[PDB]
Structure formats: C-alpha cells, structure tokens
Design a protein around this ligand. Sequence first.
Ligand SMILES: NC(=O)c1ccc[n+]([C@@H]2O[C@H](COP(=O)([O-])OP(=O)(O)OC[C@H]3O[C@@H](n4cnc5c(N)ncnc54)[C@H](O)[C@@H]3O)[C@@H](O)[C@H]2O)c1
Ligand SMILES: [Mg+2]
Ligand SMILES: [Mg+2]
Ligand SMILES: [Mg+2]
Ligand SMILES: [Mg+2]
Ligand code: NA
Ligand code: NA
Ligand code: NA
Ligand code: NA
Lengths: 493, 493, 488, 493
Amino acid sequence: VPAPNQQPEVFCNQIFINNEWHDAVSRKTFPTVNPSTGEVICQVAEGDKEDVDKAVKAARAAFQLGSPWRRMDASHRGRLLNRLADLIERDRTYLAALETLDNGKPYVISYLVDLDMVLKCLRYYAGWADKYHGKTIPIDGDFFSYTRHEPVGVCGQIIPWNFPLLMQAWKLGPALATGNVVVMKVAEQTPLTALYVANLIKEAGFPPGVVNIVPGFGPTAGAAIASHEDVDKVAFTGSTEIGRVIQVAAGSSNLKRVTLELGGKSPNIIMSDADMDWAVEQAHFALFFNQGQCCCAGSRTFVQEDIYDEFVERSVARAKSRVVGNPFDSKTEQGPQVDETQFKKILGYINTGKQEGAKLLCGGGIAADRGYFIQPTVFGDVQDGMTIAKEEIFGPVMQILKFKTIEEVVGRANNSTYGLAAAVFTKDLDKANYLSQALQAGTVWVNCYDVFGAQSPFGGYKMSGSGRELGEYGLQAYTEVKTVTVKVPQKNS
Amino acid sequence: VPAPNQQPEVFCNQIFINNEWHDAVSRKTFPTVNPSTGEVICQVAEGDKEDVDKAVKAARAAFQLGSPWRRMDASHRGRLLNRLADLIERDRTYLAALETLDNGKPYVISYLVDLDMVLKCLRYYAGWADKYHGKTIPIDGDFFSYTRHEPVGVCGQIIPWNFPLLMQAWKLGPALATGNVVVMKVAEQTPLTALYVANLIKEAGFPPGVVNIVPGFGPTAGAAIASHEDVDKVAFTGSTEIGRVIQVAAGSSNLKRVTLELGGKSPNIIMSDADMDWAVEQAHFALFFNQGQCCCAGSRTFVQEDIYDEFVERSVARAKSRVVGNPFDSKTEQGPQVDETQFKKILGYINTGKQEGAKLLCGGGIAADRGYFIQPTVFGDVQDGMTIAKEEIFGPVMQILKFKTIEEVVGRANNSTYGLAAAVFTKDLDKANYLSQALQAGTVWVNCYDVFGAQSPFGGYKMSGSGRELGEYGLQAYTEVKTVTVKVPQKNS
Amino acid sequence: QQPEVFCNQIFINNEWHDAVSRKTFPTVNPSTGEVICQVAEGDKEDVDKAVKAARAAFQLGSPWRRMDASHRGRLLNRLADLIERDRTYLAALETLDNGKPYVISYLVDLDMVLKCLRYYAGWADKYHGKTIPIDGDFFSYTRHEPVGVCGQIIPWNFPLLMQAWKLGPALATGNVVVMKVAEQTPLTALYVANLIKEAGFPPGVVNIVPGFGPTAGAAIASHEDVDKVAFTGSTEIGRVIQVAAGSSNLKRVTLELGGKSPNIIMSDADMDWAVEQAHFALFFNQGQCCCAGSRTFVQEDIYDEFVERSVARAKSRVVGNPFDSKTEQGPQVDETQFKKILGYINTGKQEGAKLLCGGGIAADRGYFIQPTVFGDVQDGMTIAKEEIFGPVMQILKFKTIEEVVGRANNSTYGLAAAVFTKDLDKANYLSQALQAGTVWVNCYDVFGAQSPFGGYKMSGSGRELGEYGLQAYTEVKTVTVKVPQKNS
Amino acid sequence: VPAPNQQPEVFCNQIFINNEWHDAVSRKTFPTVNPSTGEVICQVAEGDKEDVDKAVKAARAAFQLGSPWRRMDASHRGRLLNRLADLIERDRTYLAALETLDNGKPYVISYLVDLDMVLKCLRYYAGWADKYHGKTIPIDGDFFSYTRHEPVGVCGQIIPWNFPLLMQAWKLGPALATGNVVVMKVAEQTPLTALYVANLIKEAGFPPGVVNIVPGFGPTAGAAIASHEDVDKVAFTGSTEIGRVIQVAAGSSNLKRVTLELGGKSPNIIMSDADMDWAVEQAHFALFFNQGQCCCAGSRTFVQEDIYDEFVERSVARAKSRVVGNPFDSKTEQGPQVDETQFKKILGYINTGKQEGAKLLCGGGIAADRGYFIQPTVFGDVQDGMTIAKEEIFGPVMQILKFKTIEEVVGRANNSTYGLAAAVFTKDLDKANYLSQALQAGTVWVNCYDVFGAQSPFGGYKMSGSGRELGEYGLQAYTEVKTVTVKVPQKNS
Ligand SMILES: NC(=O)c1ccc[n+]([C@@H]2O[C@H](COP(=O)([O-])OP(=O)(O)OC[C@H]3O[C@@H](n4cnc5c(N)ncnc54)[C@H](O)[C@@H]3O)[C@@H](O)[C@H]2O)c1
Ligand SMILES: [Mg+2]
Ligand SMILES: [Mg+2]
Ligand SMILES: [Mg+2]
Ligand SMILES: [Mg+2]
Ligand code: NA
Ligand code: NA
Ligand code: NA
Ligand code: NA
C-alpha cells in the first residue's frame, strides 16, 4: 500500500451538468465534515428542485433519438467505461485518501477494498455493453417476432454515504453499459469523491448530459428526482423508511420504474461442527466491517449451544483487541462513524440493549474525545424480542444469540421483515444445502461473509429491497423491452 | 363452431379459498349483468378485506417450506398446467358461452379467439415450469457462486373485465409455472368464467391454497390485496389511474413488488406505399376489435396525405357495414359494451369529439333499444390537441389523422404519456426498420395488428405500465433471485 | 401373457415396407435363446429410400417446415400420451426383446421415456435466437433453424429410452429423422413408429430402418444427403462414424460412447447408503449401462467394512426370469456379450484380482451370469481398464483425496463419476477435479430430462438431455441488414 | 493513416513454446516471400511432429488442475485479453506494415480494416471471460443439479493466409476467454505477423504454455496436431478438402472435438428494385475485396433480368477502374495474390471460364511483370452448370448471372454444396424477409456485404463448415459441459 496524502486537496465541489460545473441556482452551499475530527472539509453547492430540473433536461436532450449517445456503438460504450476505470486506477491513491477523509473508513481499506471493487465493477460492466441480447421468437402463424433491449432512459440514482465511490460505480456501471443517461444525487455526508469522478467521466470522453450529478439534501434534491415527471426510472439505495417514500413518489407522479436496495438485519448461523477459529474471525468481520456501517452486516450471530460459550469468549477477546483510531494510521481497523447523528443513534441502541436484558460483554461507550469513535461492543444472550435484535443499528454493535436446532434457527432467522443476506458456517454438506435453501435472503454465504463479486447479483428479499444489482441481473432494471412482430409471406422453421 | 347454450347455468358464484367455496364473511352479494339485455344473471358473493385476509392466510400456508406445493417437482407443475388446459378445452363450449353472456363479446369470437388464446397461454407456460434456470457464476477468488430462481411468494393478481378468461390465464400461467401462490381479484363486471375455472383448478389437482379467487369490488377487495402486509407481489392490469393507487399502496405497506399493465393511445401508422385493402381492414380490426375495449387498440390512425382521402372513404364504408347485435348470432361482429358506466363514458367522448371540431363521418349514437350497443363511429380530420386523440376511449370510436413526413409522424406518435403499442403499414424495408426503432411502444406491429403470441412479451412504455407479460419475460416478475456464495478449497476454471 | 408383435418391417413415409432385398433377420429372447420373430433387414437401398422421404418432408414450404413450433410441442405430448396408454405392452415387449426385469421396464424405462418426451415438448417454441447490437448502422439477429436430415444410430441396452433421447430434441426443433435401431432390440422402437403415425406426425418426419451396423448404419453415416449424425454405442464404432462423416459430406456429429466410471467412497460416507448405491451403480440393468460405476474406489479406513457389506449384498441379488417379480437381474442381451463378460472374469482371476463371489454362469438356459465382485483390483489390471458391460464389480483401495483424483482421471474415458461423503469441502473439490460429464454426489444413476448427459474425452462429444440437447440439432444463421440510422 | 516503413524489420521467426523462442528440433527453416516482388523476406523455423509434441506437452502442463492458468480468476483472463489488444494497438503501424509485406494486401486496408477488426475481436471476447454462465437446474426428486462450463482443454488451432492476424484473433479470442490452452499452426505463406503477436502475448502476461505457436507446413505440423493423442479439440479454417482430412484425423485418433470454417461460392442477389449505384459498388466490394481471397466472397452475382444489362456495364466499368499495384502506395486497391500457387490456380480458372463459354468482359490476364498480380476479371452470362459458377476461385474473378423470379433465384442459389454466406439487395420488406429465410447460408446480408461484427456469429451451412465463430456462439466449441447432481435432505422450489 502506497503512502497516502493525509490532506488531499479538493478540486470539485459544485453541480455537474452537461460536463460543466455550476453553482446552485440559489447560490447556497453546504459543508461536508471530516468525521475523524468534526472539522469542515469544504463547502459544496446545494442542489435543489431547480437544479434537478436542469439536470433532467440535459439528460433528456442527451438521450434524444439520433443523438451521439443514442447512436454510439454499444462496443464503444464498453470502451468508455474501461477508460473511466483506467482514469480511476490512475488516481487510486488520491481517491482512497479523499474517500477516507470524507467518510472515516481506514485508508488501507479504501485503497485495497473500496477502490478495488469500484474498478472490478466498472470493468465487468464494460464487457456487458454489447452482449445483452434480445430474442428472435418462433411465434405462431406467418409472422417474424423479435425483441429489442432498449434503454429505459433518464435514470435517477440516489445513493448513501457508507460506500460513496462503490455505490456510485454499482449505479453507473449497468446504466451506462446499456445506454441510459443519469441524474445522480450523492449523499450530503459524502459528496466529494463522486464529484471528482464526474470530472473523470468528462476526461474519459462521455458525451455531455449522459451523466449529471446533483449534490444536496434528500427531501429536496432527492424528492425532486423521485417525483420528476420526466424521469423514467429511479434506483435508490438507503434506509427502508425513505425507500417507501421513493416508491410512493414514483406512483404519485409518472409511474417511473423503481428498484430499491434497503437495510437489513442479517443472520450469521454458526453450526456446532464449524471450524472455530475461522468462524470467530469471520463473524467479527461480518459485523464490524466498515464501522458496522454495512447494509448486510451480520448483526444477528446465532450460535449453536454446544459451542456458544467458547464462541462468545473468543468473540469478546477479538473485539477487545480491535484497534480504533486515526484512519490514516496503517494499524487502524476501525475509523469513526460517519456523522454525529449516526454516532448518537448507535449509542442510543446500546442503551436499549443494556436495559432490555442483554449482557454487555465489552465496549459500550465512546472511544475518543474528538471525532465519532465508538468502542467495539458485544452483547451476549440476545433474545429475538429485544430491540438490538430486531432493528438495524448500523454501528460496531454485535448481537450473539443462542440456538439448539436447525429447524429452530431457520424459523428465528426468517422471522424478520428484512431479508438482505445470511450466512452459514458448517462442514456438513447436507446442513449447508438445506440452510441456504431454507433461508429467505438475497445472498447466502457459506463458510464466508461479505464476499461480493461483480458477477454475482446482490439485493434483498422482503423489506430489504426489490430488484438486484451486480451480475447480468443488474442490467434488467435498466432495460425496456420492445416486441416487434412482422407479417411475412410464409413462415418456415 | 359448436352450438352454444345461450342460457348457460351458473355453478360457481362464491369465494374460492383452499379449493373450497365460501360465502362472503359479511354474507353480502352483488349482481352481475348481461350487457346484451341489461338483465341480472345471478348474485355473486361480495368479498372484502376479511375474505382477502382468509385467502392470503391460505396462500401463505400453501407456500410454507416443505409443503406439497414447495416440494412438488417443477416438471409436475407443468403437468398440472397442462391438465388445467385440457379441462378448459373439455368445457370450451360452456366457457365461451358463459364468457359471452357475462362480457358481451360475440360467441364466435369467445370460442375461436379468447378460448384459443387461453389454451395456448396455459400450454406455453406448462413448458417453462422446469426450464427457467438460475446461473453458475465464475466469481473471483476461491468461491463457488450460483443463483436460485425461487418463487416471489404470495402473489396478488388484479384483473379487468375486457378479456376475463384470457386475463386470468396471462396471470396464472407464469405464476404457477414458477411455483408461486395466488390471490386473484377478478373484475366485478365479469367474475363468472374465472370462478368456474377455479373449479377446474381444483379438479386438475392443484394443492389447496395455491390458487384463491375473491370476487368483489376494487376499493374494497382490490385495495385490501394491494395494501396487505403478507402479500409479496402484486400484478395489476387496468386503468392508468388505478395503477397509481396500486403503486402507492405498495410503498405505503410492505414494499411488495409491482408490475402494471395499463391503458394506451396506440398510433397506427399507414405509409403511402401500403397495400390499401389490407391496411384498411387491419386498421378497422385494430380499433373495433372486442367492441373497441382493448388496451392496445389503434386509436390514433395516422395516414399519409397522398392516400388519406381514399383511406378515409374505405374506412367509413367498412364501419357502416360492421354488424352490431346479438352476441349469439353467428353474423354479429360487435356485441354491446360491458356495462352502463362504460356505455355512457364512450358516448361522453363522442360528444367531446363533436364539440371539439372532429369530423363525424358515421355512427355517433346508440345502436339498440336494449343492452349497451354503440354504433361503430369514425372521426376524420382529428388533431393531436383534441381530447379524443389524447385519452383512452375504450369504445368503437375511430380517430383518423393526417401526416406528411416520417420525421413528423414519429414525433407526433411519440408525443404521448402512453406507449403500449403501435403499428406500421408499408412495403419499404428502411421505413419499416426506422419506424420500429423510433417508436416508443412495448409492441410494434409491422403490416399487421393485435398479433398476440404466448411466446412474445407484451407491455407498456411510459405510463402504459411497467414489466412484461407473456414469453420468457413473463417469468421474471414472478421470480426472486437468491445468490449463494460458497468458500471452496481451490477454485479452478 | 407374452406381448404379441405387430411391427417388424421398415418404416418410411408412415408406411411399412419389406427390405428391397426381401431379407429378414431374427430377433431373440435372451432369457430363453428362442427366436421372437423375423425382422426386415434394412440396407443401403432402404436407407436411400428413407433419406429421400426425409428430404422431401424437410423441403421448404412443406407441412413440417410451416408447422407452428408450438404445435410440434403438442405432437410430442400426444406421442407421450399414446406411449403411456400402451405402457404395459411396451414394458413387456421391452423385457421380451432386451431381457431386463419387467418391473424395471415398467417403472423405470417407460417412466424416463415419458419424462423425456414431455420435457422436450416444452422446448419446441422456446429455443430463441438473438438480436445483436453490432457496430455500425446495421441490425443483426440470428435464427435457430433445424440442421435438417438427422441420422440417429442407437444401441440395445435401453431401446425405448435411447429412442426417446434422440427423437425428443430432434423433433422439438423441427428436424427430420432416419433412425437405425440395434439389431438385438428392434421391436419396441418399431411399435413406437406406429404411435408416431397415430399422433399425427407428417409422413417422412420420422423413418426407422431396422438392420445391422456395417450395412444400414454405415450407409447413414456415409450418406451424401444426411446433414447430421448422432451415434450412441461403443467407442470403437464412434470412431468409424466420425471418419465416415469426414470422408463423405462433413455432416455434423455427436457421440455418446462407453466409459469406466469411478465411484468414490470417502471415509466419512454414509456406509449403508454408500453400499446400496454402489451396488445399484454397478449392477443396474445387468451392468449394461454406459455410465456404470465400474471402478469403486474405497478409502482404506473403511475398505474391509465396505467390501464385506458389498459382497453380502451381491450374494443376495436374485438372478432369473425377468417376468418374475422376485428377479433383480435378468440375462445379458446376447451370446456375444455373455461370452465376453465370462472372458473378462477369467482375466480378473488370472491377473491376481481377488474373486469374492460369483464368477460363473447362473443358469443352464439363457445368458445369465452370477453377480460378481473382485477385490484389491489394481489400476493396471484388464478389468480396471476396459468396459465389461456386465454384472462384474471392481473394488479398488486408495488413501488420499489427491490420489483418487489422479487415478480416477487417468483414463481415456470420462462419462460419469460419483463421490460419497458428508464433507462440504471434499464434495466441492472432487466434483470440480473429476474429468466427467456427470458428477453424482451421494447418489448414482440420477438422470434428469432437465440435466445434460455426455462424456469427456473418448466417452463422446456433445450432450443429450436438458437445453444443451437442442444445440446439436440447431443450425445458426446470422442476418445482418443495413438500416437508415442505428440507435440503442 | 501513418506512413509505414515499406521494409519493416523482422524480430520473430522461430517456434514459440512456453513463452520462449526455439529453433526446430531439426534446425530446419523455410523462406517466406514478399508476393509483391517475388523476393524472400527471411527464413523461419520449420516446425514438424516433434516440435508439435513439445508444444502440446507445454499446453497440457499449463492446463493442469491447480496451475496458475486454471486458478486465475475468469475476470483476470478478461484483463489479459484487453492488455493484449492494447499492445497490438500500440504496435498497430508496424503490424499493418508487416502484414502487407508477407501477405500482399494494401497497407491502408491492413491498417484501417484488419488491425481494427483484430482489436475489436479481442476486446469483445475480453468481456466474455467471466460472463458465460452455467445453469442451476430444477431436476425431479430430492436433488440439486447444476452445470459447470469448463474449458475443453488443449486446443489445436490451424489457420490460413488470407487474413493472418485476423484469423489468429478469431481463434485466440474465445479460446482464451474460456480458459483453454492453445497450440496454433499458422499458414506457411504468412507466419511473420502471428509470431510477433506471440511476443506481445508474452509481454501481456499470459502464463507460459497457455499459447504456443508453431510455424511450418500442413501435412507435417498441421497433421501432427490433428492426429495428436493429447489434443482435446481442433479448430480449422481453410479449404474444404483439408477440412475433410482434419475430421478424418480426429476420428482416427482420439475423437477430439472438431469445428471447421471452410470455403464457399456465395450468391449475391440483386433484385430489380435495388438501388443501382449502391448495388454495383457493393457487388464489386463483395467480390474483389482482399484480392478476391475471401471465404465468403460474393462470387455468384445474380441480377434480375430487367436491370442485368445496366448492372453489367457499370460493374465492368468499375472493374476496369480498379487500381492494381504496389500495396504500400496509397492509391492501390488491389495488391498481388498471396503466392505463386494461387496465382496459377486463378489463371487456370480464368482459362476454364473462357473455354466453358463464359463471356470475358475485361481483365483475364496478368497485370504485372513482377510479383503475382492479376487483372480484375469479369465474366458475363455465367450459367449454373459452369465450373467457374460452382468452384471457389479465390481471386479477382467475378461471375454475373441472370435470373427472372424470386422462386427461381432461391433454388439456383441453394443448389450448391457450399453455404457460407449470401446477400440480397432490395427495397422491398417482403422480398428481403422471404429470401433471408429461404437461403441456406450461415450469414445473410441485406443491402450490404462483408459486414462482420465481433458480436455476430459467422460460419457455414453444409460443406462450408460446422460450428460458428464470433459472438457468444463462438464460446460453445471451447466449452466442455459438466453436470453436477447432488442429493439433498429436502428439495424445495
Ligand atoms: N455407449 C453405450 O451405451 C453402449 C451400448 C451398447 C454397447 N456398448 C459397448 O459396445 C460393445 C459391443 O456392443 P455393440 O457391438 O452392440 O455396439 P456397437 O457400437 O457395435 O453398436 C451400436 C449401434 O451402431 C451400429 N453399428 C455397428 N457397427 C457399425 C458401423 N460399422 N457403422 C455404423 N453403425 C454401426 C449397430 O448396429 C448398433 O445399432 C459392448 O461390449 C459395450 O461395451 C456401449
Ligand atoms: Mg434520512
Ligand atoms: Mg374504476
Ligand atoms: Mg458390433
Ligand atoms: Mg493445401
Ligand atoms: Na463527510
Ligand atoms: Na357482466
Ligand atoms: Na433381442
Ligand atoms: Na509470404
């Protein structure tokens, strides 16, 4: 890992439309903060309704029939994506540092993980651009029938702050590969890295209007996008609460298509024949990864009674050893939480666990005088009815539960309104096959956790969302299907 | 066509749950009418919220892990669909007669067209039951990744009155093929035929709770389904207006998945090099088919100016000769409209057509002293700004417009919030291709119209809906994708 | 009562013909050695007639070419219904001609035939071509047209089933067929020809020529107007087919040949389950199965235990009259196979393999052979390298997982393999390392109409069953058209 | 287009095994000639049987389970292909010059056409590396069943001289994308450019033994590959005659898998309603492209009788204006034929045509006193029975035939043992659709010719070959299918 610039200069902080930088129409700005210190990094243009309208107009004009973007060879769309990746890899060190500065996550993780996954995602979809075929169809009668897979059109894309650059790539990848145009609303907490990528989108050679980015708040710029009469489709990643607002706004306006990637309360199931060392460490990673700020965090650690006590012991020891501090320090495993609001929600959730009957085993408090650092926390003997067991905490707070049978654990794991992910640790073929089938979750990991691949779809069952990102499946929401049926003189096989 | 019983007995008129017939909890009933005579056929149980709750309860139970329906071989689901089709074919005469009694469409059409399409749809999806594969995926690292295409679960299906049996089949086909369970709410105007099919579903061998049917009204039974906390997915076919309500109810409850098949104002474009005779007869069929009550009716007939006058004259002559009358008469081409409400609505739009300066060329009034018959009506010299050019009439009212260039006609045809279908009539290869590409419609017919194939998807762009039915694409909405990612000792290609 | 034979001639254009030469060959009941009846002996001239009728039926604009794809599917389903109608009869006739136990014919073979035909009935109108976003102002798409006149040559071990595996995909995709059934078991396929006619398939779409290999079979392989050949049988003949294809008109070729499939029992396997499945893996259908687990690799820590149970089970296996419900194992198909198996057993004894049970003739009438088990078999022994195709089990000892992989893969065959273990990692590693077209885990001989089957290496090329089964029966055509202005 | 060095230096002229350069075991070398001057460029190592054995052993070693190439992420195979493309583009000017020196084709063509098509092919298949999924299958019973798409193994690839670089790419692209290893035998007439690419393959980062290249002759090196006991698959492009020898060798040896791309006599059909200017120029291109040395050349130009006389006059005019000379000169449209053998073969067919009674309208003789240049030649009033109408000439020799009806031209066009390609020129939709359906050809062009796309498959019907190259279809022949069926405790949908 290369030595970072621990004070990266910010170059982009305005609204991005038609490959040009603009102030908000209202000329207002908003600050973004370094969560490791609480100090303002810079000001950023605050986009609102009128700024979104301009963006949507630029997108619509870029998507017009006969335009450079509509006529561009599909294979060339692929090259542009590949070019965008090369530019990002060129500025990898800068982008990882800036990612850390604005989000809080350890620089080493931003560099080796986040940036790596951004590149793999973009390079994967570069390859899909000219391979997502429609069909020729042997319909009855003297007819020739076939389908075109056309772009859905103007796509509103609203993303969260936990993985700023990665969330942007999961959005742009499929959308651009299939020839759509984009109006993207980045999180107010973490707008900087995505704005710089906007500049690279320009340098890459994407026609103006194809990607537009409006920094700003949710109920303003986000809402204006979800209710816009000329936005054909919206993709939203964030809280379940706002996911319902997006869905309602879509139906209330123009019936735009919607996919949603929401929260979760994912069960990590450790069977009694599991490799203890592997399972303990992976359970740790499953919860504490990215300051616990991960949609699919293994926040319900079910442990078979035969190994419960030993597992808790080692999980506490590992937790107590987790290094918390400055994200630019190569030794830090956990940076601060994203902002003050998160910081306090988490602390609140810890208090409920204490009063509700959970056994605090370690941590449970503030870890530093400055920034938003929280001590790695582990709760023992958690019950399904407890608050910390049912609600997404989005912090370094671990829930260790206890079970006896496979049939018990399936029922308790599935007794949730969430269904984003699940995992099973066991050496037994039958138990593995049975659990992964029985569990209601979009992703079931076996003997591992948080294994993401650009090739494999990701998304939620139930209230954890609808639709899927990554893989071939991620192309589906960005495709409008047209059937063409033609009368022919004489149909032959 | 075999001689029908013009007074078919009614055997099924209650609520269908767990393969059993029940009265409404409230014991309330509602009348369904013969549109040809305006007389009441029989009373039908009026299902409401509580009856929906029982249906969902039964559907959830049937969908439980380890149930007969979840463990049944995919191939055997196919056989069951095939058995249902065979039973329907056995009772074809009866069902076609009952369809005509309750809906109004010509008995000859019910038999040779509707029933035929019901059989073709069910047999088509019987073949998909064991063929909609998931994927094995070459993900990075030492992992084996694959997807399961599981059923989405409890599916609410809400259908209209214009093709009662066919609409039922378009819904059951893909849903049962992929192992889902159904709570279906049929149109209050035409509940009878679908209820008798429920008897065939039972006779066929489908497990109890797999298909449940609740006859009743929209804002009561329909809204209860759309807002139900334990319904996983809703498929709605009907008006654009109610489509908004469905989408809102989804987001306002449990984020159930939504697909919508709505209305349209489909352009039918006649180029100056078209076969006049063929184009006139097809334009007639495109509008007047099924009493004009077709989502994708060609209700904007664009004709190139060099052939406009001749086209109009011939179109008028054909409309004047269209036989309107008793649906059981083998000579009738057009029965009555479905009910009083639709009847008045069409007459209302004809008034608006006169008031706004559209040239009334034939018909324009009531066509009988009993029932809901309307004279085939043709408006000429129609302009884009007119109401009859913009709104879905859903009656035997034809609009003929004039255009000059290809450029012009593409823009005018696309200048609409609808986009369900469109057609192009020409002998020119390039014109056919440019148009089929330029048109924003889910189906584009060339030198033909209303050609539906079980193999070819159908659905709308824009506010004509979202998602597709028929073909392989019809399976997508009824599938929930699960990624399983397993750690392996050593990954090899 | 034995089933009466109704069909014993050459089937062309939905009509029954004698051979041009008027020659006939007898077919025999292997349980008694007695002649069942005479059968028309097709040769080159009869093949030429069948091919001509096939070509005519495939002509552009013909009823079969113009027929809706969905309707081809209905025809397949109707053919299935008729077979099920006559299920009892076909099962019995299958037993009479082949030798396999009647109960197995009825519950297994006939069941698998119905599932195959009904599965492919559903594919008829679902095998889409593609529309393709090519560079430039062009629109590009592909058609999946039928390959054309398809010669199909099949073996005697599962006569109805092999027929179905061939007809299913060929007919679903609109091809026409000239089929050459095995001389040892021609009867049941000929009765199905009558059903094909009853179901309503147009004349010339399916033609069946009974006869011998070097005559009727070679005439099909070398024919100048046959577009595609599909052969199931011995590796030796598979080579002949291939050469004939190249030497003639370059017709497309797929092959399903023999094997020497390893069945691998790890030390943590379910012992009872493993023993029963290993027994079935080898002895099923008188051992006359291409994918028979004829190399049973057993981990050393459970070797003796496995062997003892395996020998006990083999000694309880009932051999005799296939129409007797007690019978688990009927006779071998004919005298040549009978003698050949006895020969292999002798090499086993001579080469130092340990005869644990059987080894001899099991009846003084018919071609019955005792269930036989060899222990301590070495990789270099004849019975370990060559296909026996009889009720002769080889049990080999191994120690490590890396060892069994190397030894299992050290073969010119690669049709099938199996692994018995409770361990997730061992199962996944082995199923990946093994060079076999089908890898069973904790089961054996599990065939699905939905899942492809075929060999690596010299066990064949191409796959049958599943979607993959349609590939070899499809010819791809690209149509690329200039358009005024390409848009996404 | 950069001015080339007309005398480019040769850096590679040995055998390429395990990323190393080797002299032949025999130390034998063969000279390769500049077809434009008849002069020796340089000597090249002559591979034979023992050199093939070494290459195959190296390929087998590289393909061994657990090797770097087998364990390499599919995504990384994709990255390597892209790197190879970049290096080829980096050295584009040099490769274009060397191609022309060894083959004879115009440098402008080598640069703008061949090199461009190479880059597109490799970059296309780069995207496939991690997207060619196997399936998860809903088999009957309590089982989980799926397929793996594994590589076929050691692939012998034998290529011709007409498109040396392009043919290499069409082979390496799909083979490498799917993780196979290659032993490639390049044409003895044009070994130079493929050997340089080997150097780039090494520079790109492909593991040693993954691609091995053996220059040498057909019946020696080529046959050694076709008959090798340890080669799993062979793909051959060349003459139908040798195609039969390859197929026989496969069956006589180890039953390796075989795909063939052979010659043809493709019909170019000009309807009376075609655009004359466009049809004439495209018909010219279709035949004369690449000195006529193109497998799918339109060497049977059927022209409807009403436009025959005019079409012929303009074709002859265009033929007489075609510039023949030095390939490096920018005005040159036609270079020399590849070698002396092809030179005499073409003079033979020209003489055959004259003695057969075909009307010689222009050319028909030698065009220069040095090199192998042949005058553009046009024969008129060609009949189906003529030899020049049936056999592949592979030279600048055009045949023009007359026809009357569409039904007639179909029969005459299909009456051939070849079926590689065909074209139709017309403005009529119906004629285009009927013909494209009726013609027995692997590729049918409509109002265009020689339009190749990396996305669209190419291959012959009948004796023009078997299997397809390019597109997704090109991956099939390089994939071995494995079904894995696992017993599970309880199967659910
Ligand atoms: N792969 C299998 O499922 C299978 C089936 C039967 C036999 N076998 C093996 O083959 C051995 C002998 O059996 P067999 O002789 O019946 O098999 P075979 O390969 O000789 O016969 C298979 C089919 O091909 C035909 N045939 C034979 N010679 C031919 C030729 N020269 N040209 C064209 N077609 C020809 C036969 O008539 C028969 O219908 C057995 O010991 C067994 O090991 C394998
Ligand atoms: Mg919020
Ligand atoms: Mg209403
Ligand atoms: Mg033989
Ligand atoms: Mg030669
Ligand atoms: Na921030
Ligand atoms: Na009614
Ligand atoms: Na027999
Ligand atoms: Na040369």
